[PDB]
Amino acid sequence: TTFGRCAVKSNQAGGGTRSHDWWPCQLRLDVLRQFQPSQNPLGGDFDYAEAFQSLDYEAVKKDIAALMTESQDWWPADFGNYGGLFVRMAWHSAGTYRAMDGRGGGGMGQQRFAPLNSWPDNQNLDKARRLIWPIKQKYGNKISWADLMLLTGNVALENMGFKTLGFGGGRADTWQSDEAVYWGAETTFVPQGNDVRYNNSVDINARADKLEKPLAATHMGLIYVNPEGPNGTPDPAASAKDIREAFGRMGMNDTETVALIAGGHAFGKTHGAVKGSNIGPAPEAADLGMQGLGWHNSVGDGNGPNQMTSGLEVIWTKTPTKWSNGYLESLINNNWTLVESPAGAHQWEAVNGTVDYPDPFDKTKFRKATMLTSDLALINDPEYLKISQRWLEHPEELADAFAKAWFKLLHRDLGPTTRYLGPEVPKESFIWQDPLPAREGDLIDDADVDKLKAAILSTDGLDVSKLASTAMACATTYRNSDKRGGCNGARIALEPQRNWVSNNPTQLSAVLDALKKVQSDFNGSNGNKKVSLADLIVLGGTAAVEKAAKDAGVDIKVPFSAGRVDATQEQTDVTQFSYLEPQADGFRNYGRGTARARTEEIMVDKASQLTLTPPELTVLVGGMRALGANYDGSDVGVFTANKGKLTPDFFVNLVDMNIAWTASGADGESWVGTDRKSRSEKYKGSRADLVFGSHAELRAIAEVYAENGNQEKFVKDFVAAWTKVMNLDRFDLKV
Question: Looking at 412, 466, 598, 643, which residue binds a second copy (CB under 8 A)?
Answer: 598
Closest CB 663 distance from ligand HEM, rounded Å: 29
DSSP letters along 152-192, please? Answer: HHHHHHHHTT---S---B------S--TT----S-SS-TTS
Pairing of strands 590-591, 681-686: unpaired
- CA distance readout (Å), 658 to 16, 327, 439, 674: 39, 74, 54, 8
Binding positions are 265
21 binds a second copy (CB under 8 A): yes
Closest CB 422 distance from ligand HEM, rounded Å: 21
Q: Which is nearer to ligand HEM, 230 or 422 (CB)?
A: 230
Q: What stretch of H or E contains 470? A: helix 464-475
Q: Which is nearer to ligand HEM, 268 or 302 (CB)?
A: 268
Which partner from the list a second copy, ligand HEM, none does 706 bind, CB cut-off 5 to 8 Å by kind? a second copy
> Binding string, 193-232, against ligand HEM, x = CB under 6 A?
-------------------------------xx-x-----
> Binding string, 358-387, against ligand HEM, x = CB under 6 A?
----------------x-------------
Integer Cα distance of 735 and 721 in angstroms: 17
Closest CB 261 distance from ligand HEM, rounded Å: 5
Binding positions for heme b are 265
Integer Cα distance of 87 and 175 in angstroms: 24
Closest CB 245 distance from ligand HEM, rounded Å: 11
348 binds ligand HEM (CB under 6 A): no
DSSP letters along 297-347, please? Answer: B-STTSSGGG-BSSS---B--S-TTS--SHHHHHHHHS--EEEE-TTS-EE
- CA distance readout (Å), 600 to 585, 596, 637, 638, 661: 9, 11, 14, 17, 17
Question: Looking at 260, 436, 515, 617, which residue binds ligand HEM (CB under 6 A)?
Answer: 260
692 binds ligand HEM (CB under 6 A): no
- Restricted to residues 661-720, the positions that interact with a second copy (CB under 8 A) are 661-663, 668, 671, 676, 687, 690-691, 693-697, 699-701, 703-704, 706-710, 717
For 402, the 3-state DSSP assignment is helix
**Non-local CB neighbours of 363 within 8 Å, separated by 6+ positions:** none
DSSP letters along 356-401, please? Answer: -EEETTEEEEEE--EE-HHHHGGGSSHHHHHHHHHHHH-HHHHHHH
- Residue pair 240/377 in contact (Cβ under 8 Å)? The answer is yes
200 binds a second copy (CB under 8 A): no
Q: Which is nearer to a second copy, 26 or 354 (CB)?
A: 26
Stretch that binds ligand HEM, among 85-93, 193-201, 426-434, 561-569 (CB under 6 A): 85-93
Integer Cα distance of 434 and 573 in angstroms: 8
DSSP letters along 11-74, please? Answer: -STT-S--HHHH-TTS---GGGSSS-GGG-TT-TT--HHHHHTTS-HHHHHHHHHHHHT---TT
**Non-local CB neighbours of 339 within 8 Å, separated by 6+ positions:** 347, 348, 349, 351, 370
138 binds a second copy (CB under 8 A): yes
Q: Which is nearer to ligand HEM, 88 or 453 (CB)?
A: 88
Which partner from the list ligand HEM, a second copy, none does 54 bind, CB cut-off 5 to 8 Å by kind? none
Active site residue 411: no
- Restricted to residues 523-552, the positions that interact with a second copy (CB under 8 A) are none
Q: CB neighbours (10 Å) of residue 424?
A: 16
Integer Cα distance of 218 and 326 in angstroms: 28
Closest CB 270 distance from ligand HEM, rounded Å: 3
Catalytic-labelled residue, pool 92, 271, 411, 695: 92
Q: Which is nearer to ligand HEM, 271 or 684 (CB)?
A: 271
Which partner from the list ligand HEM, a second copy, none does 87 bind, CB cut-off 5 to 8 Å by kind? ligand HEM
Which partner from the list a second copy, ligand HEM, none does 661 bind, CB cut-off 5 to 8 Å by kind? a second copy
Closest CB 438 distance from ligand HEM, rounded Å: 33
Q: CB neighbours (10 Å) of residue 527?
A: 8
Cα of 459 vs its chain's centroid, Å? 39
Stretch that binds a second copy, among 138-146, 329-337, 569-577, 721-729 (CB under 8 A): 138-146
Question: What's the length of the chain?
Answer: 735
641 binds a second copy (CB under 8 A): no
Closest CB 385 distance from ligand HEM, rounded Å: 15
18 binds a second copy (CB under 8 A): yes
Q: Which is nearer to ligand HEM, 132 or 567 (CB)?
A: 132
Angle at 362 between CA 361 and CA 363, to 5 degrees: 120
Q: Which is nearer to a second copy, 7 or 447 (CB)?
A: 7
Integer Cα distance of 396 and 634 in angstroms: 58
261 binds ligand HEM (CB under 6 A): yes
- Restricted to residues 290-329, the positions that interact with ligand HEM (CB under 6 A) are 309-310, 312
Stretch that binds ligand HEM, among 12-20, 256-264, 584-592, 692-700 (CB under 6 A): 256-264
Torsion of CA 41, 44, 48, 53, to 10 degrees: -110
For 582, the 3-state DSSP assignment is coil
- Residue pair 600/636 in contact (Cβ under 8 Å)? The answer is no
Question: Looking at 120, 168, 236, 268, which residue binds ligand HEM (CB under 6 A)?
Answer: 268
Catalytic residues: 92
Q: Which residues bind ligand HEM (CB under 6 A)?
A: 78, 84-85, 87-88, 91, 224-225, 227, 243, 260-261, 263-265, 267-271, 309-310, 312, 374
